[PDB]
């Protein structure tokens, strides 16, 4: 599995088996850890290895977890930024993940963010 980490934040996404997606600074969590899948050809699923649920981005902005392989929502595109940072980019709404400082996590179109930053990491 990999670890998806906010640089600005050092907080790691989290999937809940509840579906709620958050972020949390814990390492020993026992839902941080995903495994990034190929679908089709140029885009990712990024799915929780512990529950099975796969990260979605809503139309509305909020984010949560789901286990619908139909849903559109849930594919991504990563981008290098340089430095070993990456953009998680939804491609059916064009948002990028964010995690905020108070740990919700949520999308948004603006490239400039500084909290939409990520590390890939192997744990």
């Given at each position: ?7 600005e ?105 500084q ?9």
């Open positions: 599995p990999v670890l998806l980490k906010s640089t934040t050092g907080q790691y996404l989290r999937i809940n088996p509840d579906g709620t997606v958050d972020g949390t600074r814990d390492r020993s969590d026992q839902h941080i850890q995903f495994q990034i899948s190929p679908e089709g050809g140029g885009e990712v699923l990024l799915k929780s290895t512990e529950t099975g649920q796969y990260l979605r981005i809503n139309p509305d902005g909020t984010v949560d977890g789901t286990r619908d392989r139909s849903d559109q929502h849930i594919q991504f595109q990563i981008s290098p930024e340089g430095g070993g940072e990456v953009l998680l980019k939804s491609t059916e709404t064009g948002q990028y993940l964010r995690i905020n400082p108070d740990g919700t996590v949520d999308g948004t179109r603006d490239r400039s963010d909290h939409i930053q990520f590390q890939i990491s192997p744990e």
